[PDB]
Amino acid sequence: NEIRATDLPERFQLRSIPVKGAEDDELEEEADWIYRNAFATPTISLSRKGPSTIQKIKEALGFMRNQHFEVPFIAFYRKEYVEPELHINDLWRVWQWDEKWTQLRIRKENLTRLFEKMQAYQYEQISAIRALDTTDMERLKDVQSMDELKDVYNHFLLYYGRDIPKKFGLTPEQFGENLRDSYQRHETEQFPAEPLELAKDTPEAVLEGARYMVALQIAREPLVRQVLRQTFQERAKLNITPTKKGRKDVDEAHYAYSFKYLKNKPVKELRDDQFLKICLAEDEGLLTTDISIDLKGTYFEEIKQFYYRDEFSHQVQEWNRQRTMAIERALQQFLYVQMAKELKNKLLAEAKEYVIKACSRKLYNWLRVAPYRPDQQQGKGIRVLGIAFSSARDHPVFCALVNGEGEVTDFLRLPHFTEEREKKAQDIETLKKFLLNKKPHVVTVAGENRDAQMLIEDVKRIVHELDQGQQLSSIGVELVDNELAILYMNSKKSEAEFRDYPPVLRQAVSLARRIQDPLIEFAQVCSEDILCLKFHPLQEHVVKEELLNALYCEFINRVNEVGVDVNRAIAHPYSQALIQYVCGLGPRKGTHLLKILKQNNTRLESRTQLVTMCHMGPKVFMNCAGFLKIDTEVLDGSRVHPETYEWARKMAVDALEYDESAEDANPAGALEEILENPERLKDLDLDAFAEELERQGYGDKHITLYDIRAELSCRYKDLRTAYRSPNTEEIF
Amino acid sequence: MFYHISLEHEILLHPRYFGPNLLNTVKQKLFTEVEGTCTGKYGFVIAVTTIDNIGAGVIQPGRGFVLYPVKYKAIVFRPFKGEVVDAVVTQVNKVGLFTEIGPMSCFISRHSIPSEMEFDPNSNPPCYKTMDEDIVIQQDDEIRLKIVGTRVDKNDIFAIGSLMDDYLGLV
Amino acid sequence: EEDASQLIFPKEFETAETLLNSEVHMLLEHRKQQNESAEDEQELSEVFMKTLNYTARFSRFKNRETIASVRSLLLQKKLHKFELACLANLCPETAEESKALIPSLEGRFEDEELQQILDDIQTKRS
RNA sequence: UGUUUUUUUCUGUCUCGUGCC
């Protein structure tokens, strides 16, 4: 009930999980956090500039928090408030930045509360090396510094004690400042005393008593972490070199085994190149990995001079020796190890980001719906003749002739093949009989090896020479790679459509569907189904959650750009269940709407079907106004929502120069005439439309004017690509 | 808990192993037979330190195999109920905590944990903190526990921990 | 019935020899040092590696003489063998914590008598 | 620019008589 009958859409609620909406004051903080954490290591969103990008992100976050906007809903419906088509990852990136800012703010508030409580406890205890509750404010203010803030908080907890009932060397702050500035402003304990005298005032009789305390203070100091942070993570020439056993076990398969003596790989090769990071992670798993910056030998020398006394005559020499010992102890405790851990974390993050980017690129390349319809647009669509043969060696090859309306019309088998060692006529006769049995619109043959390609070519030649494409014309059998149809044949949809059929028929049906409506097949699959297709080997090393989220966002954006047919998902099972990746219409909401439509028998009468029938809430309708499309009002099956219906009608009337009288349906010259083709484009001016929107409407229509004109001129525009014929390398 | 006791065992030696390296072969076979295994009587065995003596090989009638009842001085790890040890947390999940008592892995549920240690699913690393956020428990931390139960899954010990007694956390 | 809290164990286990974390750590380290040499030998298993990295994170003292001294100063008392491992391994701070963790110490000895032993154990730590 | 096959220890009852070393 909360997912389907909720005030806000499902996408908006899912995006802002940690942060339930954005407040007026919190919007600026979220935008600043997103801008700061938008592209630190690599260049991303530098398109939108720094200040402009930050302003756009803040506007998108505010819109999402107020109107329950989503990724596509804010990228398209809020083109002005956000980057106007700056990049595809606009809404998703803004949502991620807002969530990160909210999480950082919550963590900072918790840290500040903990610091205040600790300070109050210390004041109550000691007020009746001190313990002052001054770092709580710094920790609470340090929202951007997540890892550094956590390290500082942990160091403070371990230094003050952490107990909850109910003069040795330089000071930590001075040492941290001298190390950060590069110049040792404060030296060690410039006193005549030496470690001999300091080791008697604890009860150990050892000169290393104060060294442990100094090391603990240095390790648990936020200033030290900040100074060390970014020094090696920014640049680290990781030298890849196989070990004695890694040289033979890797066999040049991983990053630490391909180059026997190829070292000095900077951070750009691991972060920017996700393949190198994945290889290093895989090699460092079992056998070994070669990950060493080799730049400290000189970064750790400069710190040695700082914090140590300069004179050497007993007191000065003793103080300098003690400072050097304390610095060495601190470095061994949390100096090299902390830097190595930070570098490893940065490398892992870079590898994960590269894997996610590769997966997103693969999803964008393979998800674009580019079917091969009749004439590359008698009857709606074309009859795709899905030919998914098994071997083509005297075995029954599936050959189904499905229609262009997301359904299979018929099919047949072809056991005869060029089986028989010398039989060049049986296959031709079988192909001719199959072609004469039905009247397909196109041929969709598969391929596995040289024999499969030869069989497909022979079938195409026989069809073209005897006009077997339609019985009265030659039909070109379009080549289709056996990539999507094989997976779709043995899916839930394939099993439900046909249960008592061989796998060849299912493969042929899947191939025919993949070359008729890729969007329908993508929306009618579990997303499990998407995870089956591997986007790249480096994605396995990185977390699959990021890849899945990127794929879901890409699918949602594609669905929003191409739209969804309301009547298509009412009676046709092939084009059903396509309301799961809509902007603002989540999976639960889509399922509830489909169930309501199946029960009440309500059709896609107009854009307000879910607002008038009481099926969808006002926020859901507003967020999903630009994605729901119907067969028939005039502006229902398009991106024009109810708010912009009057503006679209007025613009169409002005462009067509027709009469103005409550035009919603009755005047058709401005609606039908403009929908048929461009009637008058100079009549509708951008400045006039923007002024009208600002004076009446409460919003500028400078960016939305083009979208409204396109929706009024072309309804149900598809955002998928065109039919991509197989190439030489692609075919192979 | 690790202990050092004297155990006994016999291994059949195929006649092909006869020769100047008979004792060496018997020792080698003993090493790769009673290391890492587990039994319900003495518990989980870690490794063997030294061997006391080699018994007299009684050749079986009608069979070339000869058995050597060797008595080896090896160590053993047989945790009991009520003992308190110091382990390290391996993973933190809402269902429960996972640790690693050397060759054995225990598990503590949220019910055993007091109500003060809440969940932190929002943060990337699964961790449990209090309202004031003073004490923090995460993975790779030397956290103590109490063995309130034992189990042997066919030579695979898997005990169960608890976190009700006071003074169980960071030392 | 087998509960170490109430000092009860089977007959075979009653005659066992207790081991400390440092003792087992050094024994396994020496075994590894002996096994790594003498090539053409079956290498260690995952069990040995996990036990090593588990006992190495609780080595209160590396010196063997420390182990000898801490066992010698403890065996002089009247406590059972079981009380020689847990108390020497956990190294509690105050007598109250030791008495709470191990219920056997409740009423078995005085407070200062156990506090002095705990302080000595803490000092013996490296 | 091609070449059609793989399945395997079964199992029988209780009684009486005759001949031989």
mmCIF file of C-alpha atoms in Angstrom, chain A residues 112-322:
data_model
loop_
_atom_site.group_PDB
_atom_site.id
_atom_site.type_symbol
_atom_site.label_atom_id
_atom_site.label_comp_id
_atom_site.label_asym_id
_atom_site.label_seq_id
_atom_site.Cartn_x
_atom_site.Cartn_y
_atom_site.Cartn_z
ATOM 1 C CA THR A 112 28.833 16.491 17.184
ATOM 2 C CA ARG A 113 26.309 15.045 19.642
ATOM 3 C CA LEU A 114 28.818 12.412 20.767
ATOM 4 C CA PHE A 115 31.540 15.044 21.192
ATOM 5 C CA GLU A 116 29.201 17.261 23.221
ATOM 6 C CA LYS A 117 28.234 14.325 25.446
ATOM 7 C CA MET A 118 31.890 13.384 25.966
ATOM 8 C CA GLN A 119 32.807 16.985 26.801
ATOM 9 C CA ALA A 120 29.938 17.207 29.293
ATOM 10 C CA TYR A 121 31.009 13.933 30.916
ATOM 11 C CA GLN A 122 34.621 15.123 31.153
ATOM 12 C CA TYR A 123 33.548 18.450 32.665
ATOM 13 C CA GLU A 124 31.354 16.656 35.207
ATOM 14 C CA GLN A 125 34.134 14.222 36.139
ATOM 15 C CA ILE A 126 37.339 16.296 36.183
ATOM 16 C CA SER A 127 35.424 19.456 37.185
ATOM 17 C CA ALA A 128 34.806 18.142 40.719
ATOM 18 C CA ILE A 129 47.410 16.162 28.908
ATOM 19 C CA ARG A 130 43.877 17.062 29.998
ATOM 20 C CA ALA A 131 40.540 16.053 28.430
ATOM 21 C CA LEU A 132 38.806 18.948 26.654
ATOM 22 C CA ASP A 133 35.610 18.617 24.603
ATOM 23 C CA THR A 134 36.758 20.970 21.846
ATOM 24 C CA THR A 135 37.166 18.462 18.993
ATOM 25 C CA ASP A 136 33.453 17.582 18.968
ATOM 26 C CA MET A 137 32.622 20.859 17.214
ATOM 27 C CA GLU A 138 35.347 20.274 14.619
ATOM 28 C CA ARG A 139 34.143 16.716 13.987
ATOM 29 C CA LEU A 140 30.537 17.884 13.614
ATOM 30 C CA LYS A 141 31.592 20.654 11.224
ATOM 31 C CA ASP A 142 33.769 18.276 9.166
ATOM 32 C CA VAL A 143 31.007 16.998 6.903
ATOM 33 C CA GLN A 144 33.112 16.639 3.748
ATOM 34 C CA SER A 145 35.907 14.728 5.507
ATOM 35 C CA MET A 146 34.266 11.329 5.985
ATOM 36 C CA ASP A 147 37.239 8.997 6.457
ATOM 37 C CA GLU A 148 39.336 11.752 8.046
ATOM 38 C CA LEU A 149 36.450 12.727 10.332
ATOM 39 C CA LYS A 150 35.953 9.106 11.398
ATOM 40 C CA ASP A 151 39.679 8.703 12.076
ATOM 41 C CA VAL A 152 39.743 11.907 14.138
ATOM 42 C CA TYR A 153 36.687 10.799 16.125
ATOM 43 C CA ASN A 154 38.198 7.365 16.791
ATOM 44 C CA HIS A 155 41.494 8.950 17.846
ATOM 45 C CA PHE A 156 39.663 11.294 20.216
ATOM 46 C CA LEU A 157 37.692 8.395 21.702
ATOM 47 C CA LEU A 158 40.877 6.377 22.249
ATOM 48 C CA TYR A 159 42.741 9.400 23.665
ATOM 49 C CA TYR A 160 40.157 10.719 26.128
ATOM 50 C CA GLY A 161 39.346 7.151 27.179
ATOM 51 C CA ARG A 162 35.813 6.354 25.941
ATOM 52 C CA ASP A 163 34.771 5.195 29.437
ATOM 53 C CA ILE A 164 31.045 5.670 30.047
ATOM 54 C CA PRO A 165 30.154 5.183 33.750
ATOM 55 C CA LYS A 166 26.535 6.168 33.053
ATOM 56 C CA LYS A 167 54.988 16.734 29.035
ATOM 57 C CA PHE A 168 56.590 14.293 26.579
ATOM 58 C CA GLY A 169 57.963 15.736 23.352
ATOM 59 C CA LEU A 170 56.126 18.143 21.089
ATOM 60 C CA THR A 171 52.382 18.657 21.357
ATOM 61 C CA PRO A 172 50.122 16.854 18.860
ATOM 62 C CA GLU A 173 48.612 19.990 17.303
ATOM 63 C CA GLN A 174 51.997 21.686 16.883
ATOM 64 C CA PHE A 175 53.513 18.568 15.307
ATOM 65 C CA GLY A 176 50.541 18.193 12.972
ATOM 66 C CA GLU A 177 50.756 21.824 11.882
ATOM 67 C CA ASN A 178 54.522 21.613 11.351
ATOM 68 C CA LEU A 179 54.075 18.469 9.251
ATOM 69 C CA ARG A 180 51.205 19.893 7.188
ATOM 70 C CA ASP A 181 52.975 23.192 6.480
ATOM 71 C CA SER A 182 56.225 21.334 5.579
ATOM 72 C CA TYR A 183 58.214 23.443 8.090
ATOM 73 C CA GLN A 184 58.799 22.291 11.674
ATOM 74 C CA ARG A 185 57.479 25.303 13.561
ATOM 75 C CA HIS A 186 57.586 23.506 16.928
ATOM 76 C CA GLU A 187 60.482 21.310 18.044
ATOM 77 C CA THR A 188 60.534 18.547 20.668
ATOM 78 C CA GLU A 189 60.694 19.058 24.436
ATOM 79 C CA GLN A 190 63.529 21.609 24.647
ATOM 80 C CA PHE A 191 64.427 20.852 28.257
ATOM 81 C CA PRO A 192 67.587 19.536 29.948
ATOM 82 C CA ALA A 193 65.729 16.323 30.822
ATOM 83 C CA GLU A 194 66.249 13.218 28.688
ATOM 84 C CA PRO A 195 64.546 9.801 28.369
ATOM 85 C CA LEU A 196 66.444 8.618 31.461
ATOM 86 C CA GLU A 197 64.656 11.174 33.653
ATOM 87 C CA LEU A 198 61.298 10.808 31.885
ATOM 88 C CA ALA A 199 61.325 7.013 32.371
ATOM 89 C CA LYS A 200 61.285 7.373 36.178
ATOM 90 C CA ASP A 201 58.639 9.988 37.081
ATOM 91 C CA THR A 202 55.936 5.368 34.615
ATOM 92 C CA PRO A 203 56.945 2.321 36.691
ATOM 93 C CA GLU A 204 58.662 0.501 33.835
ATOM 94 C CA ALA A 205 62.377 1.356 34.023
ATOM 95 C CA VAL A 206 62.418 1.549 30.210
ATOM 96 C CA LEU A 207 63.015 4.548 27.960
ATOM 97 C CA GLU A 208 60.243 3.565 25.506
ATOM 98 C CA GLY A 209 57.368 4.474 27.835
ATOM 99 C CA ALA A 210 56.683 7.870 26.268
ATOM 100 C CA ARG A 211 57.288 6.603 22.723
ATOM 101 C CA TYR A 212 54.126 4.483 22.835
ATOM 102 C CA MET A 213 52.057 7.429 24.079
ATOM 103 C CA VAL A 214 53.511 9.710 21.396
ATOM 104 C CA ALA A 215 52.762 7.136 18.692
ATOM 105 C CA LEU A 216 49.198 6.685 19.949
ATOM 106 C CA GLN A 217 48.643 10.454 19.976
ATOM 107 C CA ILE A 218 50.089 10.863 16.473
ATOM 108 C CA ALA A 219 48.072 7.987 15.000
ATOM 109 C CA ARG A 220 44.819 9.147 16.633
ATOM 110 C CA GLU A 221 45.066 12.735 15.370
ATOM 111 C CA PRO A 222 42.803 14.066 12.582
ATOM 112 C CA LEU A 223 45.499 16.521 11.479
ATOM 113 C CA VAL A 224 47.935 13.680 10.761
ATOM 114 C CA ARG A 225 45.302 11.825 8.725
ATOM 115 C CA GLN A 226 44.471 14.980 6.759
ATOM 116 C CA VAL A 227 48.152 15.672 6.061
ATOM 117 C CA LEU A 228 48.816 12.096 4.949
ATOM 118 C CA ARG A 229 45.489 11.864 3.108
ATOM 119 C CA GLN A 230 45.817 12.789 -0.592
ATOM 120 C CA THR A 231 49.645 12.816 -0.454
ATOM 121 C CA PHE A 232 49.995 9.289 -1.856
ATOM 122 C CA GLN A 233 46.400 8.710 -2.967
ATOM 123 C CA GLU A 234 46.706 11.628 -5.404
ATOM 124 C CA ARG A 235 49.768 10.041 -7.041
ATOM 125 C CA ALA A 236 51.195 6.547 -6.513
ATOM 126 C CA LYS A 237 53.369 4.969 -9.220
ATOM 127 C CA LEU A 238 52.351 1.385 -8.495
ATOM 128 C CA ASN A 239 55.125 -0.837 -9.867
ATOM 129 C CA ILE A 240 53.655 -4.069 -11.250
ATOM 130 C CA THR A 241 56.129 -6.939 -10.918
ATOM 131 C CA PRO A 242 55.353 -10.675 -10.700
ATOM 132 C CA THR A 243 56.890 -12.644 -7.852
ATOM 133 C CA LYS A 244 58.710 -15.977 -8.094
ATOM 134 C CA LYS A 245 55.411 -17.888 -8.194
ATOM 135 C CA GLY A 246 53.227 -15.154 -9.692
ATOM 136 C CA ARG A 247 55.313 -15.041 -12.873
ATOM 137 C CA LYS A 248 54.324 -18.610 -13.785
ATOM 138 C CA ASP A 249 50.859 -18.732 -12.199
ATOM 139 C CA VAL A 250 49.628 -15.445 -13.695
ATOM 140 C CA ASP A 251 50.962 -16.251 -17.184
ATOM 141 C CA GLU A 252 50.569 -12.557 -18.064
ATOM 142 C CA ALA A 253 46.834 -12.783 -17.351
ATOM 143 C CA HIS A 254 46.618 -10.169 -14.570
ATOM 144 C CA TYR A 255 48.048 -6.690 -14.044
ATOM 145 C CA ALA A 256 50.817 -8.002 -11.763
ATOM 146 C CA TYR A 257 51.904 -10.660 -14.280
ATOM 147 C CA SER A 258 51.630 -9.080 -17.749
ATOM 148 C CA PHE A 259 54.667 -6.822 -17.214
ATOM 149 C CA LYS A 260 57.645 -8.726 -15.817
ATOM 150 C CA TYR A 261 59.496 -5.428 -15.301
ATOM 151 C CA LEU A 262 56.801 -2.879 -16.218
ATOM 152 C CA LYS A 263 56.667 -0.772 -13.056
ATOM 153 C CA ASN A 264 55.958 2.884 -12.261
ATOM 154 C CA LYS A 265 52.230 2.821 -13.000
ATOM 155 C CA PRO A 266 50.689 6.030 -11.579
ATOM 156 C CA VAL A 267 47.178 6.411 -10.169
ATOM 157 C CA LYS A 268 45.847 7.365 -13.619
ATOM 158 C CA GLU A 269 46.455 3.808 -14.881
ATOM 159 C CA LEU A 270 44.545 2.212 -12.006
ATOM 160 C CA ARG A 271 41.749 4.748 -11.459
ATOM 161 C CA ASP A 272 41.099 5.753 -15.080
ATOM 162 C CA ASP A 273 41.950 2.255 -16.346
ATOM 163 C CA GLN A 274 39.580 -0.080 -14.514
ATOM 164 C CA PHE A 275 41.178 -3.091 -16.224
ATOM 165 C CA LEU A 276 44.488 -2.490 -14.432
ATOM 166 C CA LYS A 277 42.744 -2.197 -11.056
ATOM 167 C CA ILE A 278 40.754 -5.384 -11.694
ATOM 168 C CA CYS A 279 43.911 -7.256 -12.716
ATOM 169 C CA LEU A 280 45.779 -6.043 -9.630
ATOM 170 C CA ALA A 281 42.898 -7.083 -7.366
ATOM 171 C CA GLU A 282 42.686 -10.526 -8.988
ATOM 172 C CA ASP A 283 46.446 -11.107 -8.779
ATOM 173 C CA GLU A 284 46.626 -9.820 -5.195
ATOM 174 C CA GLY A 285 43.902 -12.304 -4.246
ATOM 175 C CA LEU A 286 45.641 -15.679 -4.373
ATOM 176 C CA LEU A 287 49.203 -15.533 -5.712
ATOM 177 C CA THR A 288 50.488 -11.976 -5.280
ATOM 178 C CA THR A 289 50.253 -8.387 -6.542
ATOM 179 C CA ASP A 290 52.828 -5.673 -7.244
ATOM 180 C CA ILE A 291 51.303 -2.492 -5.789
ATOM 181 C CA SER A 292 53.939 -0.093 -4.444
ATOM 182 C CA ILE A 293 54.214 3.644 -5.057
ATOM 183 C CA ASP A 294 57.936 3.715 -4.188
ATOM 184 C CA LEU A 295 57.782 7.487 -3.641
ATOM 185 C CA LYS A 296 58.266 7.702 0.141
ATOM 186 C CA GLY A 297 62.008 7.085 -0.169
ATOM 187 C CA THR A 298 61.381 11.416 -0.480
ATOM 188 C CA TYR A 299 58.281 12.026 1.644
ATOM 189 C CA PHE A 300 59.075 10.478 5.040
ATOM 190 C CA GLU A 301 62.465 12.217 5.298
ATOM 191 C CA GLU A 302 61.050 15.755 5.489
ATOM 192 C CA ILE A 303 58.821 14.872 8.451
ATOM 193 C CA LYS A 304 61.864 13.593 10.364
ATOM 194 C CA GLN A 305 63.363 17.079 10.722
ATOM 195 C CA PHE A 306 60.069 18.525 11.969
ATOM 196 C CA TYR A 307 59.121 18.035 15.643
ATOM 197 C CA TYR A 308 62.760 17.360 16.642
ATOM 198 C CA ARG A 309 65.195 19.618 18.473
ATOM 199 C CA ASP A 310 68.062 21.141 16.492
ATOM 200 C CA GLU A 311 70.786 21.376 19.146
ATOM 201 C CA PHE A 312 72.645 18.371 20.556
ATOM 202 C CA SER A 313 74.308 18.839 23.950
ATOM 203 C CA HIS A 314 72.390 16.505 26.275
ATOM 204 C CA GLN A 315 69.131 18.395 26.822
ATOM 205 C CA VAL A 316 68.810 19.437 23.175
ATOM 206 C CA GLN A 317 70.263 16.173 21.865
ATOM 207 C CA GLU A 318 68.087 14.134 24.233
ATOM 208 C CA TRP A 319 64.973 16.058 23.179
ATOM 209 C CA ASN A 320 65.825 15.606 19.492
ATOM 210 C CA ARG A 321 66.421 11.874 19.967
ATOM 211 C CA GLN A 322 63.147 11.491 21.872
#
